[PDB]
Write an enzyme that holds these catalytic residues in place. Structure first.
Site, short mmCIF file in Angstrom:
data_model
loop_
_atom_site.label_atom_id
_atom_site.label_comp_id
_atom_site.label_asym_id
_atom_site.label_seq_id
_atom_site.Cartn_x
_atom_site.Cartn_y
_atom_site.Cartn_z
N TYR A 42 118.64 7.59 23.35
CA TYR A 42 118.39 6.33 22.63
C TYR A 42 117.59 6.65 21.35
O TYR A 42 116.77 7.58 21.35
CB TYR A 42 117.63 5.31 23.45
CG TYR A 42 118.35 4.54 24.52
CD1 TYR A 42 118.96 3.30 24.26
CD2 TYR A 42 118.35 5.00 25.84
CE1 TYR A 42 119.57 2.56 25.29
CE2 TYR A 42 118.94 4.27 26.87
CZ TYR A 42 119.55 3.06 26.57
OH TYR A 42 120.14 2.43 27.63
N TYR A 64 122.04 8.26 31.66
CA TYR A 64 120.63 8.54 31.26
C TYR A 64 119.74 8.73 32.48
O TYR A 64 119.70 7.86 33.36
CB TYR A 64 120.19 7.32 30.41
CG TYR A 64 118.77 7.35 29.94
CD1 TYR A 64 118.43 8.14 28.82
CD2 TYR A 64 117.75 6.64 30.53
CE1 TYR A 64 117.15 8.19 28.31
CE2 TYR A 64 116.43 6.69 30.07
CZ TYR A 64 116.14 7.48 28.96
OH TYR A 64 114.87 7.59 28.45
N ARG A 92 120.99 6.57 35.21
CA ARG A 92 121.61 5.29 34.87
C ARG A 92 123.09 5.60 34.51
O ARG A 92 123.35 6.58 33.78
CB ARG A 92 121.04 4.60 33.64
CG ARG A 92 119.68 4.02 33.65
CD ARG A 92 119.34 3.10 34.72
NE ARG A 92 120.26 2.07 35.12
CZ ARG A 92 120.75 1.07 34.40
NH1 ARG A 92 120.42 0.91 33.11
NH2 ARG A 92 121.55 0.21 35.03
N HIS A 102 126.05 2.58 30.23
CA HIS A 102 125.92 1.11 30.12
C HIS A 102 125.52 0.71 28.70
O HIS A 102 125.01 1.52 27.92
CB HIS A 102 124.87 0.54 31.12
CG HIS A 102 123.52 1.14 30.84
ND1 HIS A 102 123.23 2.46 31.10
CD2 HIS A 102 122.46 0.63 30.18
CE1 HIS A 102 122.02 2.73 30.66
NE2 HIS A 102 121.53 1.66 30.09
N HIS A 146 123.62 -2.61 26.78
CA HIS A 146 122.76 -3.81 27.03
C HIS A 146 123.33 -4.94 26.19
O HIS A 146 123.62 -4.70 25.01
CB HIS A 146 121.30 -3.57 26.60
CG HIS A 146 120.61 -2.50 27.37
ND1 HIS A 146 119.85 -2.77 28.48
CD2 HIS A 146 120.58 -1.17 27.20
CE1 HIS A 146 119.40 -1.63 28.97
NE2 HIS A 146 119.83 -0.64 28.23
#
Ligand SMILES: O=C(O)Cc1ccc(O)c(O)c1
Ligand SMILES: O=C(O)Cc1ccc(O)c(O)c1
Ligand SMILES: O=C(O)Cc1ccc(O)c(O)c1
Ligand SMILES: O=C(O)Cc1ccc(O)c(O)c1
Ligand SMILES: [Fe+3]
Ligand SMILES: [Fe+3]
Ligand SMILES: [Fe+3]
Ligand SMILES: [Fe+3]
Lengths: 233, 200, 233, 200, 233, 200, 200
Positions: free
Chosen positions: C105, C144, C154, C157, C159
């Site tokens: 990120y 992640y 994770r 995905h 958000h």
């Protein structure tokens, strides 16, 4: 000294019992409210004691002779200790403790009305062999009433402690006997959410390992955390 | 995905754990060789210390049937895995709390520094495993020393704990018992001042 | 000014994830212990901002150009925003954010070792059309790793944030990709009790919306609370 | 019974919410137009105020990754839903807590009174939605002002809270910052003095 | 010199993809029309090169370093090479090649618009160990559009080449990733008639082999033709 | 009946086979050691030869993305399986067709005679495996030499091919390149003059 | 994945297709308005041409029951979709092969240049759809002109055909009929010189 050469498969905290299992009353005040803090494995966690040089007595694993002959069902409790990969865990420490044929423990704190057995202690220890095999000779313990709900009875069980290769694999558990009707009603057994996990705690009758006209046998295999070599670290 | 054999599920050690792992404490005769709370022989190198503490429940009441297992490096920051009663020092020991006072003790030496997997030195610590009735699966914690603040501040492990205030729970407080160096390490299983427990 | 002309279907708090979901560690200390206080709908709750006049840039919805071409699987994320009655939600704000192809990120706080992509930001916004359609163009994010359990990851995905017609309908959620083996292992995903609810979060591969020899497409429809007119109030 | 289509399930915003909803904070370049914390322009009618607060978790620790969205009427007690950066007043705003101090700020005006569905006036209030990591589904609350005791006492909404002690959790305390009228509204997600959260 | 001491289990030409599979366009003109001529095994076919002495470089098997850190999902690809009898195949050459995170190959002929990754080559080789284990470290490749049908896309895949003990066992294949929705739509994949055969090509997510907070892992086992000793020949 | 584990299914090598098995050709940097088209070093015993050919598809078009692997005995009719770049002779090699001319080359020596399992000598031959895009499972063939008519006529393998006309497809035609002995072996995958492919 | 409604499956036009789309040819009376083979009125702009050809089966025998549909741009490279018998030029037409000679004809003008989706000009071409008994789903092809070699060499579409020799199948050969400019375009459905058919 020990060396950081291994990694252990992460524990499945949904397989094992959770900390807070309210039907098991004592767990209420003895369970953390904060989440566990996860940490990477280091030499601290991937090493543990080796009990190969411990001076075991000749009858350490024979509850029949280590404390008259005890009264109760003569049984052999044997099995193997393997890892998640199915690899044997040799020269490991297996310790056990239990009650007598009547459900009475040789412990200060035990005030259950069933009497003590003059020739029974209830402790044993065995170091697994090259193949991860262990064996004990004992008498089948009896159910034990305890102050939980008003009419709770622990199924006959044997407490087990296994070291494994590291403090990461060290485990304490209980063995239950095949077909015991109390199993499914026990709050402690029920601390385990998955019925499939409970099944792993049941020792199966083993007529093949029994000594005719002498004693029966029960088979109990133990699976410790899978061990692997480090890679691309 | 790939599924391995499931690990055998843990069970509470129960209130009679002593019969199997703390014979003396059960009020039973011991065997020739027992694993107990004296990690170091008086003639062992390093700074000899006495460790003591209590264990509290979520109500603030003493846990008098608790059982603890320890693992630590020697004074040179080395893990001695070959357990032998003849050694001057053993990395592994066992202890338990008095059914009366409810205090545990351990006789060892201050552990030397060990590096993590990445090569970063961790502050001197003792690995602890807590077992007891009402505890379905044992709790993992670490004991750190208050007179090692410098090292403590730079510990890769201590630093994984988000809240600074929580890190304090792992620091044993130096004292003296009968003119001997002692460290008090109380464990709060639940609630106010709850001790940090790990997963690994 | 906005007017109190609508009522929204009460939320199903058993469909949505509960506050306290212990496998998701951080939820332990960030969940209220007191019950939520139910209140009748008023103008305060039945109204919300309209973003029709917000000055959107040309590539607001195109992550391939809004920040060189990013490295990763070029995909289109499209779908429709409807209410529980099946009625489209036009001129609504849809915002999204994700990681890069490697799971990194572009945020201060992200310390994951996967590198940043010089040509990728990770933010998009789109106002739905008259039919409630929205679309974005980006790269498929990577899984992640996060500090939860010792080996938590994770699933890939994206958000999503959707305004809807009122503050009553406003929602923040996450999109997952069809077939990701990580899905069923995620503590965040599992915060949702009903497996059927989980299915609504999985975007489906949409070959019909794909640009041959260019990029693939995924379909993700969002359902907001049903809007109805007040009656006999 | 009748079942409609199920609403898409909520998911936590996560700790990186900033890259999407608060670019500056994420430490990223912003776009021409952004929805931020300045609801009113200096030339906006009504009493100009500064709102500020902190968010606490159940251990009494600051929640430094929280994101809040607000909705309030103008000084005339009217909701301006047509969002535009050109407006002197916008009914909607966005704010976040500093990764450092962990405090959020909002520049607005004190809201005018609005009637509930039954025609009863509600005390001046600001609608708040709190999002963050560890928060599965956002939390709804209201900010009321301590200097509106009279109105507050009669609010049909405040009065729905059974325990009077609980009502005080929604009252912002008037203060002054750089000689400017400010109100402090701290949110306690869990525990002692836990803030009232609504369902609607 | 090599010696004729073995025999290999005849190949199941109905398990493997046939030559002529029309959905896969290029196979039309590149498949023989005459039947294959069956021949008895001789030293010519039962022998093959041993690569034990090939001079392998240190990062031969590590695509993350063998060519900056590449952008994409860091993964480990590991498994074992066994024969049809279940016997390990030690000291065997395993070679692989793939595209980058975006579906771009580092080959002259690749004109796909996704960009090249300056830090990624796409080639690895590993000699299996005594237990027939191999392992690679790379990034998960992206789907690749190709000129077959008007909207054909290859599922993420890694090309594998395995030598085995003889030219009789030599094989070229492809690995696919568990759950990829593109799998069942691929004309190349579909060249294989038996759905059960397709399953052998799908690598399974292996959380046990993953490096927490670092990279994930996939397990891919390869089965070569069974080797047996000649008898009554 | 008895069923063993099924062999992993084959898949085409694809057009990018070069990046993995023929780096140079892919137009990529090579590694220290590569398996290529030079089986023998100048100081290798036997008659040094150059092999070259083209590959045709069913429409009579060149297959410019083909990849071939060869296996042959040394001049003494012995298989040297110990692959080493230091050897004067390696029994194994790799070659590919030029994206331009679409011709492959191999530098080796004419193979010595080897006996089949029944003790019958086979004519000198080179074992070939052909891989390419459109080829689901590689093709097996043999290259025989036109100047070995006598041996060829008696080959237990060549004689397994029912139609004599078909046998000629496996005979390489002797030529000379830059005054060096060469043999041309063209492969026709499909159609007229289709090359014999084996199963074993 | 996402699945739409399946398209209705195609069926062979059959040998009697004429009854529905080529009335005159069926030997039936026509209606007031029919769609036929005269795309351009004599007074239409551009270069007036006559197109003719035959259709061969895999055995080299004439297909005398084939039906063709054409779509092309006007002389300005424009598609006139509004079909009207009054127009001087129509982009769409229908033709069929004689049950006797088995030749089809079309009266139109040479199409102007159109750009592809990417903005690249395609060489002048006519889109053809072939229907007939034994043809389950119609075949798509394009007719190109031999006197436009320059444009043809740069056509983005022609260039998608891998083999140069296959591109030739799409090139109509210029001639003259009754002193009029004509182009012959034969279609070989199968075998030697098989025409290139498309998918889109
Ligand atoms: O109080 C408890 O924890 C339950 C219980 C009591 C006695 C035992 O021996 C035992 O194994 C478990
Ligand atoms: O810590 C958490 O709340 C889980 C998590 C971490 C990082 C993310 O990007 C995310 O979307 C969710
Ligand atoms: O054209 C083909 O044979 C299909 C195809 C194309 C590109 C690839 O990388 C691949 O592995 C397979
Ligand atoms: O010869 C054939 O193609 C089959 C057939 C014959 C007559 C028809 O009317 C028809 O629709 C189909
Ligand atoms: Fe017990
Ligand atoms: Fe995220
Ligand atoms: Fe490929
Ligand atoms: Fe018909």
């Amino acid at each position: 000294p020990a060396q950081d050469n291994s990694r252990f498969v992460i524990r499945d905290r949904n397989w094992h019992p959770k900390a807070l299992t309210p039907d098991y009353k004592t767990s209420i005040a003895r369970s953390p409210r904060q989440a566990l803090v996860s940490i990477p494995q280091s030499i601290s966690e991937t090493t543990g004691p080796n009990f190969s040089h411990l001076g075991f007595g000749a009858h350490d694993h024979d509850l029949l002779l280590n404390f008259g002959l005890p009264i109760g069902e003569r049984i052999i409790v044997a099995g193997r200790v393997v890892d998640q990969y199915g690899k044997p865990v040799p020269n490991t420490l297996v310790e056990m403790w239990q009650a007598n044929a009547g459900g009475r423990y040789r412990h200060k704190n035990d005030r259950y009305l069933a009497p003590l057995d003059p020739n029974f202690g209830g402790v044993g220890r065995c170091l697994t062999d090259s193949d991860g095999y262990y064996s004990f000779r004992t008498i089948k313990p009896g159910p034990y009433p305890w102050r939980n709900g008003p009419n709770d009875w622990r199924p006959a069980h044997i407490h087990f402690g296994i070291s494994g290769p590291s403090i990461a694999t060290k485990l304490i558990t209980q063995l239950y006997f095949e077909g015991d009707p109390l199993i499914p009603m026990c709050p402690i057994v029920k601390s385990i959410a998955n019925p499939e996990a409970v099944q792993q705690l049941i020792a199966k009758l083993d007529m093949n390992n029994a000594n005719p006209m002498d004693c029966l046998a029960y088979r109990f295999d133990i699976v410790l955390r899978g061990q692997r070599k480090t890679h691309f670290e | 995905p790939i599924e391995l054999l499931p690990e055998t599920p843990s069970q509470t050690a129960g209130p009679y754990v002593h019969i199997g792992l703390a014979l003396e404490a059960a009020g039973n005769p011991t065997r020739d060789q027992e694993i107990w709370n004296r990690l170091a022989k008086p003639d062992a190198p390093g700074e000899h210390i006495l460790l003591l503490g209590q264990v509290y429940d979520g109500n603030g009441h003493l846990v008098r049937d608790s059982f603890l297992e320890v693992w630590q490096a020697d004074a040179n920051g080395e893990y001695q895995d070959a357990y032998n009663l003849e050694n001057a020092f053993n990395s592994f020991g066992r202890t338990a709390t008095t059914f009366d006072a409810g205090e545990w003790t351990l006789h060892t030496v201050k552990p030397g520094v060990v590096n993590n997997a990445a090569g970063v030195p961790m502050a001197p610590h003792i690995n602890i495993s807590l077992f007891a009735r009402g505890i379905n699966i044992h709790l993992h914690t670490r004991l750190y020393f208050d007179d090692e603040a410098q090292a403590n501040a730079k510990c890769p492990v201590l630093n994984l704990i988000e809240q600074p205030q929580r890190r304090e729970t792992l620091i044993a407080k130096r004292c003296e018992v009968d003119g001997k160096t002692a460290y008090r390490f109380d464990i709060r299983i639940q609630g106010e001042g709850e001790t940090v427990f790990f997963d690994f």
